[PDB]
Amino acid sequence: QNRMMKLAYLDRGFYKHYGIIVGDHVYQLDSDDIFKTALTGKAKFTKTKLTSDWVIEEECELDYFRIKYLESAVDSEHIFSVDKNCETIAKDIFGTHTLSQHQAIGLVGTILLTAGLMSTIK
């Protein structure tokens, strides 16, 4: 609960919602419809109160952006591209090209969506 950005997930009957824990709050994609989010490749973020339902991945953490920018994105209701493929993610995380705050948040949003989408595959 001090500027730490850890990956966490909420598991309801095997379907997983992923989010970023900062303090006593969770940032996640504002969607209960993963079909439409995935098909459109677009989402905004929301911030909710952390609860015991959330499971922290203490060895995972997405430190790609400053939290204030994500707070601003939540407040502004900005709609991000969350459909980057592995090549784009790989270039972003293993390369040295400039990465805007919007691109950085879109990257983390892609990771959240992809992780949640993979949990749906029956």
Nearest to 111 by CA among 32, 1, 4, 27: 27
The pair of structure tokens assigned to 52 is 């015991």
Residue 59, judged by CB atoms within 10 A of its CB (0-12, 13-18, 19+), counts as exposed
- As given in the structure block, the two tokens for residue 56 are 């922290």
Query: Quick check: is 17 catalytic?
Result: yes
C-beta of residue 59 within 8 angstroms of C-beta of residue 86: no
* Number of alpha carbons in the 13 Å side-chain half-sphere of residue 61: 11
Measured in angstroms, the resolution is 2.1
Q: Which residues are CB-neighbours of 14 under 8 A, at least 6 positions away?
A: 119
Of 93, 98, 97, the C-alpha closest to 110 is: 93
Residue 8 and residue 16: Cα distance in Å, rounded?
Answer: 10
Query: How far apart are alpha carbons 107 and 81 in whole angstroms?
Result: 8
Residue boundaries of the structural domains of the chain: 6-120
Question: Which residues is 45 bridged to in the sheet?
Answer: 29
- Experimentally, how was this structure solved? X-ray
CA end-to-end span of the chain: 35
Nearest to 22 by CA among 110, 11, 54: 54
Token pair 């419809």: residue: 33
Hey, what amino acid is at 117?
L
Residue 13 CB neighbour total at 10 angstroms: 4
The residue from 25, 60, 78, 86 that is catalytic is 86
Q: How many residues does the chain have?
A: 122
86 included as an active-site residue: yes
Helix 101-120, helix 86-94: angle, nearest 10: 130
Among candidate residues 17, 25, 60, 78, the one labeled active-site is: 17
> What architecture is domain 6-120?
Alpha-Beta Complex (3.90)
Query: For the purposes of burial, counting CB atoms within 10 Å of the CB of 45, is it exposed (0-12), middle (13-18) or buried (19 or more)?
Result: buried
* Nearest Cα to Cα of residue 1 among 18, 20, 19, 21: 21
Query: Within a 13 Å sphere around the CA of 44, how many CA atoms are in the beta-carbon half?
Result: 11
CA-closest candidate to residue 70, choices 59, 80, 61: 80
